[PDB]
Amino acid sequence: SGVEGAAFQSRLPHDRMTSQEAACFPDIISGPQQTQKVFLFIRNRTLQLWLDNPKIQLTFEATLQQLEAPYNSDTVLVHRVHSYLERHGLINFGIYKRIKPLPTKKTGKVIIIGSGVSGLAAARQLQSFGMDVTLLEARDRVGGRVATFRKGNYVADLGAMVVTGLGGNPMAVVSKQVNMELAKIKQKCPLYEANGQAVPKEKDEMVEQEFNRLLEATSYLSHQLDFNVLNNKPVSLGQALEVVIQLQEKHVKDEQIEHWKKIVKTQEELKELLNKMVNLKEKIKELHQQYKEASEVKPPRDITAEFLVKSKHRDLTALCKEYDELAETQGKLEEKLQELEANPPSDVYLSSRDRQILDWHFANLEFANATPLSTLSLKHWDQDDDFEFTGSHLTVRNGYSCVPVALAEGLDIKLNTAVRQVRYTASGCEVIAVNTRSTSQTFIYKCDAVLCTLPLGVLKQQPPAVQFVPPLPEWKTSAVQRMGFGNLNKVVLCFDRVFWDPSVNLFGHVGSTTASRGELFLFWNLYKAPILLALVAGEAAGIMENISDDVIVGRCLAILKGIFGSSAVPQPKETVVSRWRADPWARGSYSYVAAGSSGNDYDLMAQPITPGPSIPGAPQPIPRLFFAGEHTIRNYPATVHGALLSGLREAGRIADQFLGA
Amino acid sequence: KPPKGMFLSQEDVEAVSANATAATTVLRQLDMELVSVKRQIQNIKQTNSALKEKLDGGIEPYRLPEVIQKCNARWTTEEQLLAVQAIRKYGRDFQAISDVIGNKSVVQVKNFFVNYRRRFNIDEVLQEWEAE
Ligand SMILES: Cc1cc2nc3c(=O)[nH]c(=O)nc-3n(C[C@H](O)[C@H](O)[C@H](O)COP(=O)(O)OP(=O)(O)OC[C@H]3O[C@@H](n4cnc5c(N)ncnc54)[C@H](O)[C@@H]3O)c2cc1C
Ligand SMILES: O=CCCc1cc(F)cc(F)c1OCc1ccccc1
Numbered sequence: 001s002g003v004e005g006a007a008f009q010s011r012l013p014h015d016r017m018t019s020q021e022a023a024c025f026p027d028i029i030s031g032p033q034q035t036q037k038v039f040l041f042i043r044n045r046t047l048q049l050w051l052d053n054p055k056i057q058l059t060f061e062a063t064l065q066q067l068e069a070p071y072n073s074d075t076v077l078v079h080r081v082h083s084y085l086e087r088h089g090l091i092n093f094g095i096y097k098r099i100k101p102l103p104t105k106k107t108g109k110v111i112i113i114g115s116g117v118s119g120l121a122a123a124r125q126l127q128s129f130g131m132d133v134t135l136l137e138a139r140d141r142v143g144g145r146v147a148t149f150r151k152g153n154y155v156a157d158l159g160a161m162v163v164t165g166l167g168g169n170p171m172a173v174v175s176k177q178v179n180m181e182l183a184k185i186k187q188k189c190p191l192y193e194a195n196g197q198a199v200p201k202e203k204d205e206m207v208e209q210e211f212n213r214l215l216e217a218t219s220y221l222s223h224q225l226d227f228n229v230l231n232n233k234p235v236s237l238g239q240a241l242e243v244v245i246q247l248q249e250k251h252v253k254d255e256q257i258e259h260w261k262k263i264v265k266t267q268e269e270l271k272e273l274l275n276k277m278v279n280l281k282e283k284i285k286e287l288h289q290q291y292k293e294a295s296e297v298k299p300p301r302d303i304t305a306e307f308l309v310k311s312k313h314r315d316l317t318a319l320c321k322e323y324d325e326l327a328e329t330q331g332k333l334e335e336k337l338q339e340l341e342a343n344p345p346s347d348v349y350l351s352s353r354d355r356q357i358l359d360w361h362f363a364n365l366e367f368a369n370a371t372p373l374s375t376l377s378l379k380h381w382d383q384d385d386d387f388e389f390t391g392s393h394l395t396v397r398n399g400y401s402c403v404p405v406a407l408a409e410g411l412d413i414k415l416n417t418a419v420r421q422v423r424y425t426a427s428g429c430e431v432i433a434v435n436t437r438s439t440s441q442t443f444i445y446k447c448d449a450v451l452c453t454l455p456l457g458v459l460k461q462q463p464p465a466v467q468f469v470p471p472l473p474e475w476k477t478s479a480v481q482r483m484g485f486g487n488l489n490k491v492v493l494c495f496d497r498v499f500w501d502p503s504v505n506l507f508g509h510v511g512s513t514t515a516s517r518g519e520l521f522l523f524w525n526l527y528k529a530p531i532l533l534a535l536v537a538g539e540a541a542g543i544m545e546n547i548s549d550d551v552i553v554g555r556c557l558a559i560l561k562g563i564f565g566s567s568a569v570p571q572p573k574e575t576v577v578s579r580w581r582a583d584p585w586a587r588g589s590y591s592y593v594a595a596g597s598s599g600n601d602y603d604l605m606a607q608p609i610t611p612g613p614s615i616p617g618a619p620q621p622i623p624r625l626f627f628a629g630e631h632t633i634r635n636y637p638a639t640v641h642g643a644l645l646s647g648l649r650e651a652g653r654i655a656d657q658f659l660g661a
Numbered sequence: 662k663p664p665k666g667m668f669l670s671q672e673d674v675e676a677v678s679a680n681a682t683a684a685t686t687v688l689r690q691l692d693m694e695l696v697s698v699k700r701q702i703q704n705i706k707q708t709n710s711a712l713k714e715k716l717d718g719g720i721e722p723y724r725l726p727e728v729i730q731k732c733n734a735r736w737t738t739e740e741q742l743l744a745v746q747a748i749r750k751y752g753r754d755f756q757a758i759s760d761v762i763g764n765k766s767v768v769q770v771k772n773f774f775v776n777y778r779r780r781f782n783i784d785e786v787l788q789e790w791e792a793e
Pocket of ligand 1: 142488589
């Protein structure tokens with residue numbers, strides 16, 4: 001449906017009020033069901049009108065003229081719902097033409113650290129709400145971990161490149177606001193073993209299925225055997241996979257032992273039968289000789305001599321009958337024993353080639369989580385699974401940077417300004433920063449509130465890149481320690497000609513060892529110009545950062561030469577290698593749910609800091625230091641849409657604090 | 662509730678994780694266990710192969726021809742004397758006694774037991790067969 005689709009596309013249940021809505025409309029959620037339905041329709045219809053045209057501001061008056069009775073009768077209710085949706089960034093977010101030009105009277109002063117997507121989204125909101133906003137950005141560009149390489153006609157993303165499903169995704173709205181050239185990712189992905197040969201379809205499917213089954217197994221291990229702590233430490237996904245694999249190898253050996261034991265049991269039953277026959281044959285042989293002697297006493301004979309012949313005869317035929325039955329049993333046992341000798345259970349759980357192809361699937365998971373599997377929380381690593389958008393994954397053909405650049409239009413952004421210190425007190429805040437080009441140039445920014453969108457990698461840094469005065473409390477620093485911050489890198493290879501399969505967006509390289517499984521394991525064909533992107537994932541990410549570009553590119557060309565032929569792969573005209581762990585403005589790629597962490601740490605990251613009073617005995621201060629970024633949003637961590645959502649959240653929160661709700 | 666064909670008992674999980682090198686120890690002892698079961702199959706095969714070589718020839722040099730005899734209702738003196746010896750040797754095994762005489766049914770043998778019980782001291786003869 002339509003109003004129902006608007007709710008779904010806003011990540012809202014269409015037939016129920018949320019906790020956020022309960023908080024701003026306690027009168028409605030605690031009141032009769034009929035008013036709740038009216039509220040829910042007003043909300044869903046307002047969402048719909050905005051979604052049906054996100055290029056222009058949806059105003060309260062516009063909304064009301066489009067509502068029809070009975071819903072447009074309580075204009076206070078409509079105005080409340082519209083204001084709520086606007087304040088929380090569910091309508092009139094991103095880049096839209098403004099009906100009412102922005103009032104010149106600004107209220108409050110906010111410094112935003114970082115002009116990645118979260119920082120930029122917050123800034124746009126806060127400026128829309130009438131506040132004075134300045135962003136401080138250490139780099140010489142916007143976008144942060146949205147970072148597009150551009151040279152000539154070559155365009156390639158060094159950070160985010162995939163828009164997940166558009167259904168429920170706020171990047172859907174943005175894509176109608178910005179010219180993004182979105183293109184579906186065909187998920188066909190051939191694998192080539194290290195010898196350049198393709199993985200036979202038989203094997204590609206067997207091992208992928210086993211991969212999925214090993215994952216279900218770790219989840220069974222987690223949820224049914226409560227295998228979540230081992231030797232006083234939280235169990236990891238990788239560690240649970242080891243246990244599962246060991247048990248499948250154990251079961252194969254158990255099965256072999258059971259099988260050969262059936263053969264032993266049968267062999268021994270046969271041995272016992274043969275011994276019985278050998279003795280019976282001898283007894284029969286001796287008995288025959290007796291019957292022979294007695295029957296050669298020639299007639300006429302007395303009746304005892306006749307009885308001797310006739311009873312030896314009788315005894316002999318009975319023993320022969322006994323022997324014939326034992327020989328029938330012998331052929332049945334030799335049958336059973338020939339069937340067993342032909343039904344051998346499996347020899348191995350996984351051959352070497354199998355385990356290599358399996359490692360490719362593990363490397364693929366290490367890519368998606370940007371971290372080695374030995375660091376992922378077994379209990380929680382997939383905790384954002386229930387929030388996946390619907391629809392095909394897509395790439396941004398003209399470079400994802402078009403989004404942050406578009407968001408930056410109109411904002412006051414100081415590039416080349418590295419924040420060094422954040423000061424927050426009951427009367428306001430001071431942010432101290434230096435010019436990255438000449439660090440001696442110092443800058444003081446005073447403001448009512450600081451929105452910190454520094455990456456979790458930067459917050460983790462010891463000794464710190466950024467000092468908080470007073471220091472962040474332990475509940476926040478402990479969360480910063482526990483959370484995972486991973487790593488993932490890309491190699492951009494620009495050629496003058498296409499030598500790969502043009503109708504295939506992915507293909508895999510199956511590394512020879514587990515250690516190297518993440519090293520150049522996946523190639524992407526995503527762009528108009530002949531460009532391949534190669535991924536470095538898992539344990540390889542961090543190690544390959546200490547290897548020169550020429551060696552990394554060499555390894556790439558070697559792999560490709562093996563798959564496509566040595567004469568088919570020219571030298572690249574341009575190449576770029578990312579090193580995100582080493583990037584001091586990132587210190588990694590994106591967060592992961594580490595063993596020992598959980599979804600609640602993302603909530604802790606999002607919680608603002610409130611200073612103590614200046615004068616003792618003075619009233620409770622308001623909060624002063626806010627946080628956004630992909631590490632601050634429990635349900636959509638580690639994505640662009642999660643960062644954007646987190647900025648929208650904080651801007652509503654800050655505006656509620658400093659403008660009133 | 663494990664995936665089909667996956668094997669994951671609580672018992673085994675603890676065995677493979679109770680120790681730092683527990684898994685490899687588990688799979689090692691299973692390997693050696695399979696080696697000693699295969700070793701044992703080799704011995705019994707080779708032992709059975711020697712037994713089969715003794716049964717070469719079956720019992721064919723020793724099987725007598727089977728004669729059918731028309732089952733006659735009348736007892737010659739010779740057939741009575743056979744029966745008494747058969748009783749002496751086989752006891753109440755009416756089938757064996759029939760096979761010795763050749764022309765007397767199991768019923769006729771059993772009837773013989775009663776009719777000549779007195780004249781042939783058949784009770785003494787059964788007692789005689791029981792002493793050995
Ligand atoms: C290799 C890679 C691939 C990815 N794949 C995808 C994908 O395809 N799709 C997807 O949705 N997500 C993907 N992600 C994740 C996504 O890119 C991020 O979650 C998101 O862009 C980060 O947004 P943010 O605004 O929270 O942080 P950032 O964009 O990191 O913004 C923080 C900003 O603060 C700046 N800064 C740092 N230190 C200072 C300082 N001292 N003073 C001032 N400014 C400072 C940084 O330079 C940066 O501009 C990927 C990320 C990477 C790196
Ligand atoms: O290059 C960037 C990928 C980073 C990434 C991190 C996430 F946490 C969620 C994502 F959607 C995502 O981007 C697309 C993707 C989805 C599934 C598997 C791999 C990648």
